[PDB]
Each structure stands twice: as structure tokens, then as C-alpha cells.
Design a protein around this ligand. Structure first.
Ligand code: 15Q
Ligand code: 15Q
Lengths: 228, 9, 236, 10
């Protein structure tokens, strides 16, 4: 089915598949904030699973491959989402509508300010590029299918389709050929930074875990243990 | 694993 | 800047000529491997490569235009990625093996000699396998290595605009190479994307190798050189 | 300064 969709239908499908924006249980210590972030992430994870199943090509994969891809990519996916909805709040991270944190509230947790700064710099970059919603959804699907793919032709064929869709959107927006290729590259290089940020976030989350205090859901612990 | 169950359901 | 003025062909020429040499390890075949001694080999080798990497980065168009602090930051951020993409590249024609050096060609089973290392060998091998399947070309490899140098640290920053201009030039160069090679227009954007997506995997391996290296330091497995200690501390 | 900082000059 995925290989048969048009560019516009790929976009329509991904837009349709988008997960809800969730609220946190907010109403400020190292523990309370982390509880908030991990509580939010756990609930987001459940909606991410439904969304993945709606990314074209993904339900074609074995359950085992679906699990591996999600285990590798879940924090990357949460983070690009966070960056996307923070785009229009310079110097702030919109974890949720009722949880808009600035770089300084990141200092409320050891090691967290550095991660916030990377998240904020990426938001700034999206803003600089005037990243579009259609492009964002494409990039998010690329993360899902790409991050764990080396650890299969079908995945790579689907990936190429999404590249075609990105280029379609850019051509439709009036960009020259040269501009399309440059922008595609700019967009994909951000995925390097998003990988970096997930790696750092994973190590952090892991430290929080061993230190007890902040309780993580069974699901979060399991996703976490797949990276160790 | 919990992820298994969520994918099927 | 003169970098922005270079043609696609001159860009490729500059990068190919700037390529560092393949170095030998201090491997001693009179002695069996231990965890310590194998880690010693890789770190001694990395240290000697770093010096050549610095000369190389100075010849990447646009890099000399940055302040010393910017050059330091980019290299601190990308050094292990740059070492690893080179490793994967030279391992290409050795399926199942990692050519750290001509005198140090290791399979995954030798990686097991160091705790937590086999996981990393497997990722490196899978990436080499991927280069092989894509039939990555030397001209593409040099472009990708230069992209890593300029990109990895770029969002940890005016001249940031300059760097992005240079990065755009390298994109034009990649496209130029693929077209020259006869790839259709669709194939060009599809390959560009396949090539850049690999940089996400390279970043992953670098982060995992950085944590592994830090582990060996803190367990006193091997003494890292002062330069290595400095590059590492930039990540902690 | 860093060792890296000095190598960049030499
Ligand atoms: O250790 N904390 C992990 C962490 C972090 O460092 C930064 C952000 C988040 C986070 C990112 C995106 C989210 O949607 C989220 F709900 C939490 C987490 Cl869980
Ligand atoms: O402790 N881990 C560090 C590490 C690794 O896990 C894998 C490869 C290397 C390495 C990679 C590329 C090189 O050119 C090299 F000399 C070492 C290191 Cl230093």
C-alpha cells in the first residue's frame, strides 16, 4: 500500500496519523519536574504506538521488527515532537500547553540544562528554516524507519518514498532544483542532532533510574532497558 | 514485553 | 570566502588531496590480546590519527575561516564520528572485518576481548556492510566526512551562516557527483538522502563509543593520552 | 588552553 500512494496521499496519511497534544499533571524540585517529564513521556508513548502503526509500510513489518524500530527511535520521536511544538516559543520548550519551560527551569535537574539547550538550539534551527508541518511529519516517519534499520529492502523503498514526498513538498513550494536538494540535506542533517539528543537523554534517564526517587512506568523502564 | 502487547492491541 | 567560490570539481579535488594517511597500529603479535592491550591499541591508534585529522580539517574549505574556539568545538564534537566513518570506509572491502590498520584487522569475535566492545564492532560492521551495498564512492565518502566536521557541532553554537553556506556547497557537490555518475534526477535525491541518513547511524556509534571510552578511563583499563582525555571531557 | 587549541595553530 505504501509504495502505491501518491506524494499528496503520503502527506495526507501522515497528517491524519498525528498523535494528540497531551497535557501534563502540572500545578518545583528535581523530582517533581522529572516526574512530570517521565509521566508525560509515558502517556505519549502509548499514542506513538498507534501513530507508528499508521505510518505507511510499518504494519507490513514483523512484530519483532516493529518493536526494534520503536525501541531504537522512541526518544528521538518524542524529542522532534517537542522541538516542533516549541518552534513558535523562542527560548522555551512546550512540553505541554500547561508546561512551557525555559532553559533555566532545566537547571532544576542536574545534567538537564545541557539537554534543554540542545533541544532549544534545534527549535531555533527549525524556526530559522521555517520548517513546515508537512515536512515535520515526513522527518518523524524517517526517524522511525531509519534509526534502527541497520540494527529490509521494503523499509528502504518506503524511506525513498518519503524522500520523494519531501522533494514533492519543496517543488510544490516553488523551490528551485538546487534549493530542493540543499533543503533536503539541511533537514536530514538535523536528524543527526536529534540522534545525539536522544543518546544524551537516554543516558540521563538511565541515571535518574538507578538513583531511584523518580518512579518510571513499567513501559518506560522496558524501552529504557532496550538501550542497555 | 509491554511494547509487544500495545502493538497488537 | 574562497570556499564559496570553488566549483564542485575543485571542492572534490581539495578534499581528496587533504585525505590523511592510513596509519599502522603498534600491534605486537608476540603477545596475546588482553582487554587492556586491545584497548591500548585502539586508543594509541586514535591518538596518532587525531593529529592528522587536525591537519586535514584545516584543509576542509571554510574551516580556517572560523575562530580557534569554533574550530576546537567542531572537532571536539565530531572527532570520533570522523574516526569511525574512516574506519568503516577502509573496512569496506573486508566483509566481516574492521580494518583499524593494515596490521590490525579484527572480526567481531576479537571485539569480545573488551567488555562492551562487541556491540560497537557490530554497529561498525553493519555500517560497512551498508556502504558496500550502496557502493559508496571515495568522492562521496570525503564529502560525508567533511559534512560531519561542519555539522555535528554546528547547533552547539553570523559565521554560523557561513558554515551553513559551506554545507550547502557540499550538498551541491554530492549532487554534482551523482549526476556526473549518470544517476537520474530522482535517483540523485534518493541517494543524497540515503547517504545523509547514515550520518545518524555514525552519530549513534560515536555516542556509544564515547561512553565506552569513558568507561575504560574510569575503570583504569588503559591510560588515554592527554589529547584524548581532553577530547573526551568535552563530551562529559 | 587545550592541547587541541595548540595543535590547530602549529
Ligand atoms: O532524563 N530525562 C529524559 C528526558 C529529557 O532529558 C528531555 C526531554 C524528555 C522529554 C522529551 C520529550 C517529551 O515529550 C517528553 F514528554 C519528555 C525526557 Cl523524557
Ligand atoms: O572504547 N571504545 C572506543 C573505540 C571504539 O569503541 C571503536 C572504535 C574506535 C576507533 C575507531 C576508529 C579509529 O580510527 C580508531 F583508531 C579507533 C574507538 Cl577509539
Amino acid at each position: 500500500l505504501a509504495l502505491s500512494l501518491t506524494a499528496d496521499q503520503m502527506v495526507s496519511a501522515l497528517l491524519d496519523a498525528e498523535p494528540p497534544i497531551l497535557y501534563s499533571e502540572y500545578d518545583f524540585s528535581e523530582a517533581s519536574m522529572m516526574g512530570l517529564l517521565t509521566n508525560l513521556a509515558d502517556r505519549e508513548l502509548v499514542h506513538m504506538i498507534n501513530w507508528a502503526k499508521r505510518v505507511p509500510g510499518f504494519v507490513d513489518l514483523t512484530l519483532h521488527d516493529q518493536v526494534h524500530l520503536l525501541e531504537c527511535a522512541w526518544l528521538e520521536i518524542l524529542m522532534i515532537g517537542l522541538v516542533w511544538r516549541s518552534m513558535e516559543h523562542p527560548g522555551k520548550l512546550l512540553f505541554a500547553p500547561n508546561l512551557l519551560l525555559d532553559r533555566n527551569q532545566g537547571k532544576c535537574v542536574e545534567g538537564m540544562v545541557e539537554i534543554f539547550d540542545m533541544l532549544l538550539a534545534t527549535s531555533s534551527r527549525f524556526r530559522m528554516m521555517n520548517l513546515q508541518g508537512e515536512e515535520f511529519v515526513c522527518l518523524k516517519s524517517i526517524i522511525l524507519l531509519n534509526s534502527g534499520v541497520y540494527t529490509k529492502d521494503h523499509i528502504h523503498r518506503v524511506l525513498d518514498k518519503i524522500t520523494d514526498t519531501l522533494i514533492h513538498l519543496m517543488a510544490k513550494a516553488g523551490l528551485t532544483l538546487q534549493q530542493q536538494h540543499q533543503r533536503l540535506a539541511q533537514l536530514l542533517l538535523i536528524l543527526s542532532h536529534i540522534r545525539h539528543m536522544s543518546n544524551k537523554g537516554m543516558e540521563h534517564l538511565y541515571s535518574m533510574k538507578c538513583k531511584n526517587v523518580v518512579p518510571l512506568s513499567d513501559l518506560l523502564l522496558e524501552m529504557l532497558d532496550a538501550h542497555r | 514485553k509491554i511494547l509487544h502487547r500495545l502493538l497488537q492491541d
